[PDB]
Amino acid sequence: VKNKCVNFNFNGLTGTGVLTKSNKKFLPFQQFGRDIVDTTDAVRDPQT
Amino acid sequence: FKNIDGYFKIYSKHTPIIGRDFPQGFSALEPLVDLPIGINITRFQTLLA
Ligand SMILES: *[C@@H]1O[C@H](CO)[C@@H](O)[C@H](O)[C@H]1NC(C)=O
């Protein structure tokens, strides 16, 4: 679900936040992603 | 080619250009295949066509 505060378990990455479609440039090998100070910020959907 | 903790790692990038051999221009290397070999490697050699 998008645009709602939920608890996610993305491929073993457990956490809480709001997920929305991103406009980044994830290369095909890229999996997790992050932000400036070392926190998971943008995770690509493994299915879609 | 790197083989840290087994887990053979390779990276690749292709740049045709028109400059001479080995230009100074920068270029990144994207990973292509990461296969967990996990054996002992010391020697290295190539092949031809
Ligand atoms: C199953 O995973 C494969 C791998 O990408 C892909 O077809 C899709 O994400 C999934 N298919 C489904 C859920 O029908």
From Swiss-Prot, chain B:
<protein>
    <recommendedName>
        <fullName>Spike protein S1</fullName>
    </recommendedName>
</protein>
<comment type="function">
    <text>Attaches the virion to the cell membrane by interacting with host receptor, initiating the infection. The major receptor is host ACE2. When S2/S2' has been cleaved, binding to the receptor triggers direct fusion at the cell membrane. When S2/S2' has not been cleaved, binding to the receptor results in internalization of the virus by endocytosis using host TFRC and GRM2 and leading to fusion of the virion membrane with the host endosomal membrane. Alternatively, may use NRP1/NRP2 and integrin as entry receptors.</text>
</comment>
<feature type="glycosylation site" description="N-linked (GlcNAc...) (high mannose) asparagine; by host">
    <location>
        <position position="40"/>
    </location>
</feature>
<comment type="subunit">
    <text>Binds to host ACE2. RBD also interacts with the N-linked glycan on 'Asn-90' of ACE2. Cleavage of S generates a polybasic C-terminal sequence on S1 that binds to host Neuropilin-1 (NRP1) and Neuropilin-2 (NRP2) receptors. Interacts with host integrin alpha-5/beta-1 (ITGA5:ITGB1) and with ACE2 in complex with integrin alpha-5/beta-1 (ITGA5:ITGB1). May interact via cytoplasmic c-terminus with M protein. May interact (via N-terminus) with host bilirubin and biliverdin, thereby preventing antibody binding to the SARS-CoV-2 spike NTD via an allosteric mechanism.</text>
</comment>
